Design a protein around this ligand. Structure first.
Ligand SMILES: [Cl-]
Ligand SMILES: [Cl-]
Ligand SMILES: [Cl-]
Ligand SMILES: [Cl-]
Ligand SMILES: [Cl-]
Ligand SMILES: [Cl-]
Lengths: 100, 100, 98
């Protein structure tokens, strides 16, 4: 292939998220890096799907609920930031307190 | 588990392929590097399954049609070349104009 | 990811690839078998199994019929570092494929 470091980081995220979601479908509450991976992949998928920055923000609040992660993970995650390519280019997407 | 650089590259092709096929599954037209991953993983899988070079070449032509990829992708893709191990060792597989 | 963390991701991704091949009815090769059994150790530890339950379950993950001829004797030992409840542990699988 010919992956930039940024592109590879993006794939890692997709791979960590699939691993995470498999664990979620087995009934395991997610840890902090697993949650970050799931939420980050959600931003990447959104931008890939043509979603706007705002629709990605809007939707991301509903991806993991407090009950889906281990105790303490929500206060470990006041902010996630992910760069994704939207229709006008590369943008840093901010998810504030995504998990409640 | 020690992977050689070439083996790691093969893993990266399979994982990029998997991400691209998930997108196709959702009805999204594939971009250029996505199409390259899917066709490249096809060759690797073909070789792994004991198909001949010629069988993989024949098979690869129907993997992705023009409607499966974004406008412009077919003429962005006159040639894909993928090294894979066949029953007589490493071979450089050339896919000519695979997306029509 | 730390190098060790990245190694574990690589193990999961090689195992997924090996399992898809198993589902196609292909006999696994040696490194495919290693990835499957290693990912199994990693999964059991993450699920909260003890080292002993992981060892006990591991012997039944791949049978001789699931792997190419010669693979069992190429595999007298797998060792996998995994994080259990009291920290990092080196799990040994002795003769896992019979
Ligand atoms: Cl990707
Ligand atoms: Cl992406
Ligand atoms: Cl591979
Ligand atoms: Cl391969
Ligand atoms: Cl992992
Ligand atoms: Cl793990």
């Amino acid at each position: 292939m010919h992956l930039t470091p940024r592109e590879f980081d993006k794939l890692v995220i997709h791979m960590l998220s699939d691993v995470a979601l498999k664990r979620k479908n087995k009934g395991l509450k997610l840890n902090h890096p697993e949650a970050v991976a799931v939420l980050s992949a959600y931003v990447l998928d959104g931008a890939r799907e043509g979603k706007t920055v705002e629709e990605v923000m809007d939707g991301a609040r509903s991806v993991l609920k407090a009950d889906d992660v281990m105790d303490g993970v929500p206060d470990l995650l006041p902010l996630i930031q992910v760069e994704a390519v939207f229709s006008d280019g590369s943008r840093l997407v901010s998810l504030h307190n995504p998990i409640t």
